[PDB]
């Protein structure tokens, strides 16, 4: 009573959300939505301070990123640095955090069974962490690390260098990440006791009046009150000032600017920018959005449309971007074509014309209502969020919109601004526009760096000369607004549940041309459907060549549709498209109303293509840079590549692909799309508010689509050929390795292949990976502290399964090779010491996980079309193998270590890729590490697989239908 200063009144949802909602601030200020779920399986709390890298001190960069790794590491309530963690695995739990100019959000989720114990020690982070001096020194390193993988990525070093390009006094230039030398290194020789620099910091802003928690679980709303106030009303309130930031950190001297940069990757871009005011007060009208909408459309009369056209772009983002409280951005960004890169003045011209157009109609209420109704939709049927993600967004957003309005708050629209509109239109003017072009060709002609990233960049001023011509822009015929959407949804009916129905996909349908999986919504009721589609062709991966001919076809004929689609796109109604090593993948998700009209299109097309010459030549050039810029992604991603590519019967790589890409010719092409379509398989899985005959005819309709432009026949069942995973030999052990010449850090995958998917195998491998899951995280990184990106966790690839870790890190791989084969030994003892509650506790963390249901139609969708893709169409399988779990013990466990996992162990399968680092030239192969043997260096993936016999597929899981 005394410690509740506000109870908000009755919070607007939408009358589908069966959650229980209460708004309310505390005394000392804090403000908190709780959330009633009875069902839920996982209960969540988030917290967002709304402090962040803006108010870094300027002398140690990052403090606020570090602050944040720090409060998870120990408090004086709970000092076990690893208390917090260590207590959400053992109760299925997971938690994370992050940090952004102006917030800082930390949340959790757990077993709905421990709300409180994960809450209480959640809640200490900000009321005594510890921030103790070992940790520091080893968590300065984490960090490191993090800031480490940036280093090489195209986007942060562009996120960064706009900071740099504007007023340096701005606290928008600052460098939000941090490292080890801003964090350690320059603190110290400068005589800085960080320790209580974090404890400074932390003590002046983790002020309550700054603080907002959103809380969810299965208690009533009563209970979740007395529990936030019981474990937060402690926390004080230093009144202190939120930070503003009036006056845009590109002030008069950053406009009519030119920036080149000199990408990583081999991309080709031009980013255009505009200073405008703080657009979030007006959101109830949302003017930057109804630009938003129409400069970033992209159906016919579109600017993106034109500057295609022209050959001269390919994609497009326009909109509002956000900066800070008191300033933000509206951009235009596209890719550019080779001939595009040399257009970019004629590119930006284009842009003025298309805005001048806006500026000759004026504001469209139309446009605004349209807009509107379709807000309006999204929110009633909004499908129900993990916990997790729904807490940390309510958690940040509390900080923008009243209670009761938290919810409904972004989705809905309530008032026309013309004024506003053409108020923000006013500043999408060349005198005050800012450009930046990113292409290899400056390579060489660049004059300066950004400090934190490298970047290599010139700047010039933009003549008035052309400042004047874009001034001039006059309305060009070929912009024309949309029009009104004719894909909006208006038929909302659920279905009633069709008497028949079953509570698993049914096969209803089995035939040469198709086996068709169908399951009626009968749980989420919202007016949606999923429509998965897999189309089997031996002729999309029999070799290099005619994989880079299945993928073009589909990108050219998704280019083709693009206009067409955008339309379906902002209705809800979307599709997704690509190739596979199987044939082709087609999906179509949204509001079930319009969807057989969007799925005929797609097929229809797909059999009757007609490739654009222009279209192909721009397209394949693309599709060249992207096999090409793989020499940019990250060790680690080139680690479970080579290890894919290792382990797979059949996989070309990337090298040959992009040879045998120049082979691809139009005439070529259009060869190819008639004998890939000429005999198929198609299994399908139609899920939603959808029933039987109205499924059947879908599947009919595909598939007579197909045979009449396409003259389609059954594929041979024999044909129907599964890929199998190379088979290790006992005791064995073999090293792949490469070199990253990009990144300067080393990556490695450690593969320990246990045996073929099955009921018992699937449980062994998921309770020991359980078990040392949260024990890897603490020992590999938080104690040994060997980098960022450290993994753990099952591999599960052509129906066989094992054991792997993923790190990336400074150390070399033989190095990283030792502490994980150490670790190894530590788990084995841990489990002989863990008592046999221990045990159990791990038993049900693990069947909470997986007996965690989906809350929304997609979710559900896919756990089935995993079971399907699989083959193995296991639709209880969650059922089947948590009660299977429940019967393991301590014993089963350690057999399964000395049997398959221990160093010396009978059955032991190992492969490992090393990716070194891109300074070292060649390289070899406190706890204890089992002194390793000697690797068998593979020198040749393909002799690697020719001498080693491939496991057998999984049997399928008869699913007796008709």
């Known amino acids: 009573n005394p410690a509740i200063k506000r109870i908000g009144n009755h919070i607007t949802k939408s009358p589908e959300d069966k959650r229980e909602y209460r708004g309310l601030e505390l005394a000392n200020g804090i403000k908190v939505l709780l959330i009633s779920d009875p069902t839920t399986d996982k209960s969540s709390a988030a917290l967002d301070v709304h402090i962040g890298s803006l108010s870094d001190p300027p002398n140690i960069a990052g403090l606020s990123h570090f602050c944040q790794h720090m409060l998870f590491l120990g408090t004086k309530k709970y000092p076990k640095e690893n208390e917090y963690s260590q ?43 510890l921030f103790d001096e070992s940790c520091k020194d080893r968590e300065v390193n984490a960090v490191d690390s993090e800031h480490e993988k940036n280093v090489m990525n195209d986007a942060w070093r562009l996120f960064q260098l706009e900071k740099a390009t504007g007023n340096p006094k701005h606290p928008f230039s600052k460098f939000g ?17 960080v320790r209580q620099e974090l404890l400074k910091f932390h003590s002046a802003y983790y002020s309550s009046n700054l603080m907002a928690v959103c809380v969810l679980g299965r208690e009533s709303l009563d209970d979740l009150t007395n529990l936030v106030v019981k474990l937060f009303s402690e926390v004080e309130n230093k009144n202190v000032p939120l930070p503003e930031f009036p006056e845009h950190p590109f002030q008069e001297e950053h406009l009519k600017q030119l920036y080149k940069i000199v990408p990583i990757k081999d991309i080709r871009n031009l980013y255009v920018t505009f200073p405008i005011p703080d657009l979030q007060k007006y959101y109830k009208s949302n003017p930057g959005h109804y630009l938003g909408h129409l400069i970033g459309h992209e159906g016919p009369g579109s600017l993106l449309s034109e500057l295609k056209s022209k050959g001269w772009v390919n994609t497009l983002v326009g909109g509002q971007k956000e900066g800070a409280r008191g300033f933000m951005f509206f951009i235009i960004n596209v890719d550019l074509t080779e001939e595009g890169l040399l257009h970019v003045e004629d590119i930006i011209l284009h842009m003025f014309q298309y805005i001048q157009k806006l500026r000759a109609e004026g504001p469209q209420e139309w446009v605004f209502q349209e807009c509107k109704d379709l807000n309006a939709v999204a929110f009633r049927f909004k499908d129900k969020e993990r916990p997790r993600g729904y807490t940390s967004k309510i958690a940040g957003i509390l900080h923008y919109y009243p209670l009761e309005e938290v919810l409904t708050a972004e989705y809905l629209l309530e008032e026309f601004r013309p004024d506003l509109i053409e108020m923000v239109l006013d500043k999408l003017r060349p005198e005050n526009v800012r450009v930046a072009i990113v292409s290899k060709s400056f390579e060489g002609k660049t004059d300066r760096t950004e400090e934190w990233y490298g970047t290599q960049y010139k700047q010039e001023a933009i003549p008035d000369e052309v400042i004047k011509k874009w001034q001039n822009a006059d309305l060009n015929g070929k912009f024309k607004l949309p029009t009104k959407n004719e894909f909006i949804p208006t038929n909302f009916e659920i279905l009633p549940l069709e008497k028949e ?20 919504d009968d749980k989420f009721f919202l007016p949606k459907a ?17 994989c880079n001919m299945a993928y073009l076809y589909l990108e050219l004929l998704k280019d083709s549709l693009n206009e067409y689609a955008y339309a379906a796109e902002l209705a809800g109604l979307s599709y997704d498209l690509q190739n596979t090593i199987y044939g082709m993948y087609l999906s179509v998700k949204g509001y079930n109303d319009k969807q057989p009209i969007l799925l005929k299109k797609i097929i229809e097309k797909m059999a009757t293509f007609e490739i654009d010459e222009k279209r192909f030549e721009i397209i394949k050039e693309a599709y060249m840079r992207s096999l090409n810029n793989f020499r940019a992604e990250q060790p680690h991603q080139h680690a479970m590549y080579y290890l894919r590519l290792l382990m797979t019967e059949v996989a070309w790589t990337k090298d040959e692909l992009k040879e045998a890409l120049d082979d691809v010719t139009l005439p070529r092409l259009k060869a190819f799309i008639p004998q890939l379509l000429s005999r198929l398989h198609i299994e399908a899985l139609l899920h939603g508010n959808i029933t039987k005959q109205a499924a059947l005819g879908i599947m009919q309709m595909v598939e007579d689509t197909l045979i009449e432009h396409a003259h389609t026949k059954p594929l041979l069942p024999s044909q129907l050929v599964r890929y199998r995973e190379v088979q290790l030999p006992d005791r064995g052990w073999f090293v792949y390795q490469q070199r990253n010449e990009v990144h300067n850090n080393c990556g490695i995958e450690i593969y320990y292949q246990t045996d073929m998917q099955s009921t018992s195998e699937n449980m062994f491998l998921e309770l020991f990976c359980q078990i040392i899951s949260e024990p890897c995280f603490n020992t590999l990184r938080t104690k040994e502290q060997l980098g960022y990106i450290v993994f753990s966790g099952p591999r599960r690839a052509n129906g066989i399964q094992g054991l792997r870790f993923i790190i990336q890190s400074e150390k070399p791989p033989h190095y990283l090779e030792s502490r994980v084969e150490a670790f190894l030994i530590t788990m084995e003892k841990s489990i002989e010491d863990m008592t046999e509650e221990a045990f159990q506790k791990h038993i049900q963390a693990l069947a909470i ?32 193998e948590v009660a299977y779990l429940k019967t393991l013990t301590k014993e089963d466990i350690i057999k399964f270590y000395k049997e398959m996992l221990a160093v010396d162990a009978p059955r032991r399968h190992k492969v490992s890729v090393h990716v070194l680092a891109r300074e070292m030239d ?41």
Request: charged share 20%; proline share 8%; aromatic share 14%.
């Open 177 to 193: 990440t941090g490292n080890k030398y801003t964090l350690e290194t320059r603190p110290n020789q400068e005589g800085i006791d």
């Open 87 to 129: 207590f959400l695995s053992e109760h299925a739990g997971s938690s994370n955090a992050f940090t952004s100019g102006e917030h800082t959000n930390y949340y959790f989720d757990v077993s709905h069974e421990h709300l409180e114990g994960a809450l209480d020690r959640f809640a200490q982070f900000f009321l005594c962490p």
């Open 530 to 546: 999923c429509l998965n589609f897999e189309f089997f062709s031996p002729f999309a991966y029999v070799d290099p060549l005619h």
């Open 501 to 520: 129905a079953t509570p698993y996909p049914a096969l209803i349908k089995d035939t040469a041309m198709s086996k068709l999986w169908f399951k009626q």
């Open 849 to 880: 996980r997986r007996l965690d249901k989906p809350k929304k139609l997609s979710a559900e969708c896919a756990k089935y079309w995993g079971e399907i893709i699989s083959q193995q169409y296991n639709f209880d399988r969650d059922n089947t």
């Open 922 to 962: 060649s390289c070899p192969v406190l706890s204890q590490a089992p002194a390793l043997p000697q690797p068998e260096v593979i020198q040749n993936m393909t002799e690697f697989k020719r001498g080693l016999p491939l496991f057998p597929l999984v049997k399928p899981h008869i699913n007796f239908m008709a």
